[PDB]
Amino acid sequence: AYQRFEPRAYLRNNYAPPRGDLCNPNGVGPWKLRCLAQTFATGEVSGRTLIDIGSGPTVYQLLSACSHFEDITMTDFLEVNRQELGRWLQEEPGAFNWSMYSQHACLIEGKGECWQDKERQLRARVKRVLPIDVHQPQPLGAGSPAPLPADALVSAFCLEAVSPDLASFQRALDHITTLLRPGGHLLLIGALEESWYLAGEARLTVVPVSEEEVREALVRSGYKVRDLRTYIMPAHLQTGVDDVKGVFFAWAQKV
Amino acid sequence: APGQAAVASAYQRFEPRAYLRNNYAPPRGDLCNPNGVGPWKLRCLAQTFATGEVSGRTLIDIGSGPTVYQLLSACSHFEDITMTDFLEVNRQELGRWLQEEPGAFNWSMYSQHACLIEGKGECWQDKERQLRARVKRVLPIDVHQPQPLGAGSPAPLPADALVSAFCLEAVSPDLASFQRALDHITTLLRPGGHLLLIGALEESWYLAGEARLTVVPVSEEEVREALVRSGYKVRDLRTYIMPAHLQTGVDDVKGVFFAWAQKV
Ligand SMILES: Nc1ncnc2c1ncn2[C@@H]1O[C@H](CSCCCNC(=O)[C@H]2Cc3ccccc3CN2)[C@@H](O)[C@H]1O
Ligand SMILES: Nc1ncnc2c1ncn2[C@@H]1O[C@H](CSCCCNC(=O)[C@H]2Cc3ccccc3CN2)[C@@H](O)[C@H]1O
């Protein structure tokens, strides 16, 4: 099913206008970047190693993260996404243009940083791009190039999007939780009350979750929820590429 | 007056794109190095406008050339902007940019960096859009004339504020000429009005393609005395010393000054 997933279609649907229009601050893109930026600016999420779970073809979710972790592992289930990443990490031709997201991240963080430096830094600190399957109790396998356990995890729009129901969502969460050291941090972004989205020829089933469900799922996996918030999807961002109602952002800490 | 006939003649070889490349592309156009001159200039303008002490309806940019960066912070504070230059080829380059033509020089790195410094979370596309909207006219100017815009000028006079970057010292064969050109533009500004003046220190030449232009070297002391003689109180006068890495053979500039002055 994910076997028909078109990276460029997905990027077009979610990271080009209107949803990728970062000029309005009331949009979902600026909201997400702000969540991430505010969270790292507290100083409490730090360490040497970080893993991004189910990164798809996207990088925005590490823009703020990358100044606090010197070893970054990105991951996805699909080769075609791994290679779309690689195209961007290696500044190859036909890479997706993330420059506006980098620019807005610089603007939000407020340190005077130029966006080319931020990209440079992200590209430098991402050492590897590995396969992953969160449906496995060892999402990475055993012969894993990745430093384990990790100091922090980031995951945006993966678990709900690869899980037919709540229970599989819970298990997938337990599975990635093993990659993270005790005391470590999980940064989790996702769709609320969504049941499908499109990516070219692919129509993906999603489990609709509520904020309450996400919270309880986090507790039951062994986390303290340091923060959990919601963005309600305005009407002009309801575009026929999915049925998302809102987006959640969770900051959680392993006990 | 002979001196200014030489200036006019010399400018007839002025090539915008060469001038842009020399001064507003890398390494001088490198906005990543905060210790660079581009950021220093944007910071001077941002910090001055962020006091709120400089505001009004009308602003005039004196000797804009083919450049736009010097209005990026200002345009949030003035609803009517006049841009000006001696050369048609520069005025046309402005035209291209006003029309959002591809093939126009790209000021997006400057617009972004200005957005970054001002700290209001503005995106650069909106900044540019606002600038294009607030620029109400692009006019011939000659600062050596007692009426630099001419007699029945379109321009709303007197203006609430003037900006001038790298003009007066670049078109004046000597200090006395510099002084008079200053007095001339000062007639365009209302009393109580503000002048933001950026310029080269101790430079005697720069290159604009074919053209190698003679300019009067001035010091900070000279700039300050001239402002005083023209009837200004100096609120701020800052100096940037050009690092060796930015001394590239496009001019013999030693530093840059930023002056904020208010007309008595
Ligand atoms: N078994 C698996 N293990 C790990 N990862 C897997 C996997 N199967 C598929 N994946 C990957 O998960 C990524 C999911 S991309 C996320 C799509 C979520 N769908 C949406 O409709 C969101 C996306 C979105 C994004 C930004 C702002 C708003 C919205 C609205 N809702 C893809 O790259 C797969 O290869
Ligand atoms: N008679 C006249 N009245 C008014 N404007 C006139 C004029 N004759 C010529 N102009 C215009 O003056 C402008 C002068 S622009 C160039 C002068 C700059 N010299 C420099 O050396 C560098 C130096 C520098 C250094 C660091 C960062 C930026 C810069 C920018 N300029 C041109 O557009 C003329 O058409």
From Swiss-Prot, chain B:
Gene Ontology molecular function terms on file: phenylethanolamine N-methyltransferase activity
Enzyme class: transferase
Positions with a binding annotation for octopamine: 203, 251
InterPro entries for the chain: NNMT/PNMT/TEMT_CS (IPR025820), NNMT_TEMT_trans (IPR000940), SAM-dep_methyltransferase (IPR053384), SAM-dependent_MTases_sf (IPR029063)
Outcome reported for the amino acid change (mutating residue 169 to A/Q): Strongly reduced enzyme activity towards phenylethanolamine. Increases affinity for S-adenosyl-L-methionine
Entry keywords, A to Z: Catecholamine biosynthesis, Methyltransferase, Phosphoprotein, S-adenosyl-L-methionine, Transferase
Reactions performed catalytically: phenylethanolamine + S-adenosyl-L-methionine = N-methylphenylethanolamine + S-adenosyl-L-homocysteine + H(+); (R)-noradrenaline + S-adenosyl-L-methionine = (R)-adrenaline + S-adenosyl-L-homocysteine + H(+); (R)-normetanephrine + S-adenosyl-L-methionine = (R)-metanephrine + S-adenosyl-L-homocysteine + H(+); (R)-octopamine + S-adenosyl-L-methionine = (R)-synephrine + S-adenosyl-L-homocysteine + H(+)
Residues engaged in binding S-adenosyl-L-methionine: 19, 24, 63-64, 69, 85, 90, 142-143, 165
Assigned GO CC terms: cytosol
Gene3D superfamilies with a match to the protein in the record: Vaccinia Virus protein VP39
Role description: Catalyzes the transmethylation of nonepinephrine (noradrenaline) to form epinephrine (adrenaline), using S-adenosyl-L-methionine as the methyl donor. Other substrates include phenylethanolamine and octopamine. Also methylates normetanephrine.
Protein name from the UniProt record: Phenylethanolamine N-methyltransferase
Lineage: Eukaryota, Metazoa, Chordata, Craniata, Vertebrata
Gene: PNMT
